[PDB]
Amino acid sequence: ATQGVFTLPANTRFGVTAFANSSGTQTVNVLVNNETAATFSGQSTNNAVIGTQVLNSGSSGKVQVQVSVNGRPSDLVSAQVILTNELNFALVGSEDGTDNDYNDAVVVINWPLG
Amino acid sequence: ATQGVFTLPANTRFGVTAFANSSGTQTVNVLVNNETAATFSGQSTNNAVIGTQVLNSGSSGKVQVQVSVNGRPSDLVSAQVILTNELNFALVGSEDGTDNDYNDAVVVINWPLG
Amino acid sequence: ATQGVFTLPANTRFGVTAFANSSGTQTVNVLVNNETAATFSGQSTNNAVIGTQVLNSGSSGKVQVQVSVNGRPSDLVSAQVILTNELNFALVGSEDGTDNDYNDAVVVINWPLG
Amino acid sequence: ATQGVFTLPANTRFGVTAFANSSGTQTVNVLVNNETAATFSGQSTNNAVIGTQVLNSGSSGKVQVQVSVNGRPSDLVSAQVILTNELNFALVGSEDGTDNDYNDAVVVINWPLG
Ligand SMILES: *C(=O)C[C@@H]1O[C@@H](C)[C@@H](O)[C@@H](O)[C@@H]1O
Ligand SMILES: *C(=O)C[C@@H]1O[C@@H](C)[C@@H](O)[C@@H](O)[C@@H]1O
Ligand SMILES: *C(=O)C[C@@H]1O[C@@H](C)[C@@H](O)[C@@H](O)[C@@H]1O
Ligand SMILES: *C(=O)C[C@@H]1O[C@@H](C)[C@@H](O)[C@@H](O)[C@@H]1O
Ligand SMILES: [Ca+2]
Ligand SMILES: [Ca+2]
Ligand SMILES: [Ca+2]
Ligand SMILES: [Ca+2]
Ligand SMILES: [Ca+2]
Ligand SMILES: [Ca+2]
Ligand SMILES: [Ca+2]
Ligand SMILES: [Ca+2]
């Protein structure tokens, strides 16, 4: 199944934050309407924040997260969860190796903001 | 129901990160085994990270998030989600006022790390 | 926070199914735009299906699950989860007493159908 | 990533229920101890319940859902959600064709019971 693709409400501000847990340097690309809107790159085995940014979902609402390590795409897992019919999380994990911890880059998208 | 209480695997490192979206100054207490382990505070209407830390869940695994603003406990919402039977998110939103956006302090707990 | 309220897409067929795990007889009311659209009643301590139905989310998309035992509202817990940006679950648990198992009536809403 | 595999608490009763939404007849296999513990079969495009059962999660607690249509494995998507730290849902969708609706068989596992 496709993973890391989410339809946000259109024209809505959202936060995106990435954490790293791997010996490999992680590159996280965030696309809005198929166009790169943010890129974070960092390395940590202690869950450091390698980037955080406020974006806007634009006219289409389409948001896609991609993760790669030294140019190789990581395998993604994702889901969206909504609490009290209001608070939204779009969640991504990724695996760059063999251990299937799926935390090598962890990406959290949250909305609404403000 | 009770919200913001999670049973993590015991003796396991986890990340905890808080974001703010409110005119009010948020005070976020993170309790492990019923004792305060971290306190994040700050103010933002733009989803700023007001704290991020690595903690150990200890012998009980019990982690609780509490949020105060204006000297009163915010109303909390929460859930835990597990992806590919490996990657865990414990999610918290909170409401300090009347608009029920539930984003005034947003807390993300993630594990495993490393 | 309000629980058991979900915004579905307008005019969309959805499934609703309820299970019982309590000595109390469970009554599950499903409202679509604030009007009762289905009602299930039954008693089981073994997860029996007390009702399943297909409904239409109608013009508003607003679907509300209420659970009561002989007219007394149970405490509710709920969330929505979306898998691969397409498959939606709206989940409800409920507690009619003191033990906090939250399974006394369990309600699953799923869409799309077909 | 692997989908449809969940760690339940060991030696614990759980409910498993499947719904069908496809022209193809769905075959849902539920494994405990890596061995088939239940199989549900049926055909519906209207979310019919094609099986519901109570099982014990066994020695390991590992429960796996597989779905096939005329013997061909469907692609699976899954996640687990925990509400109020008590009520657990393990959720599966499956895709037998080209439309990416992932509802062709929908499987819900819930625990605890009683
Ligand atoms: C090696 O590069 C694998 C890599 O880094 C490890 C430290 C660990 O985080 C592993 O999960 C990750 O795939
Ligand atoms: C007043 O302090 C209310 C408060 O701040 C607003 C800017 C908005 O974020 C609202 O959701 C929050 O409760
Ligand atoms: C009353 O007996 C309590 C009630 O029924 C029990 C059998 C058990 O399911 C409990 O969770 C429920 O609240
Ligand atoms: C075959 O026709 C495809 C199959 O059945 C359809 C009626 C629809 O449910 C589709 O999602 C499913 O894959
Ligand atoms: Ca890894
Ligand atoms: Ca890792
Ligand atoms: Ca608010
Ligand atoms: Ca706010
Ligand atoms: Ca109960
Ligand atoms: Ca019960
Ligand atoms: Ca399909
Ligand atoms: Ca289908």
Residue numbers in the entry:
A (entry chain C), B (entry chain D), C (entry chain B), D (entry chain A): 1 to 114
Q: From the publication, what sentences describe this entry?
A:
Membrane disruptive α-helical antimicrobial peptides (AMPs) offer an opportunity to address multidrug resistance; however, most AMPs are toxic and unstable in serum. Here, we investigated 31 diastereomers of the α-helical AMP KKLLKLLKLLL. To establish whether the CD signal observed with diastereomeric AMPs was indeed caused by α-helical folding, we prepared derivatives with their N-termini acylated with an α-C-fucosylacetyl group for crystallization as complexes with lectin LecB,67 an approach which we have successfully used for oligonucleotides, cyclic, bicyclic, and linear peptides, as well as for peptide dendrimers. X-ray crystallography confirmed that high or low α-helicity as measured by circular dichroism indicated α-helical or disordered structures independently of the number of chirality switched residues.
Crystallization screening provided good diffracting LecB crystals with well-resolved ligand electron density for complexes with the fucosylated analogues FHP5, FHP8, FHP30, and FHP31. We considered the nine most potent diastereomers detailed above, the Lys → Arg mutants HP32 and HP33, and the inactive, alternating chirality diastereomers HP30 and HP31. Although the inactive undecapeptides HP30 and HP31 with alternating L- and D-residues in their sequences had almost the same number of L- and D-residues, their flat CD spectra most likely indicated a disordered conformation considering that an excess of just one chiral residue was sufficient to indicate folding with sr-ln65L6. A similar situation was observed in the LecB complex with fucosylated HP31 containing four different asymmetric units. Diastereomers with four and five D-residues (HP11–HP31) were generally less active against bacteria, especially against A. baumannii, K. pneumoniae, and MRSA, although they all kept significant EYPG vesicle leakage activities, reflecting the fact that vesicle leakage activity is often not sufficient for antibacterial effects to occur due to the much more complex nature of bacteria compared to lipid vesicles. In view of the structural studies above showing in several cases that the degree of α-helicity of ln65 diastereomers as measured by CD corresponded to an observable α-helix or structural disorder, we assumed that the CD signal could be used as indication of folding across the entire series.
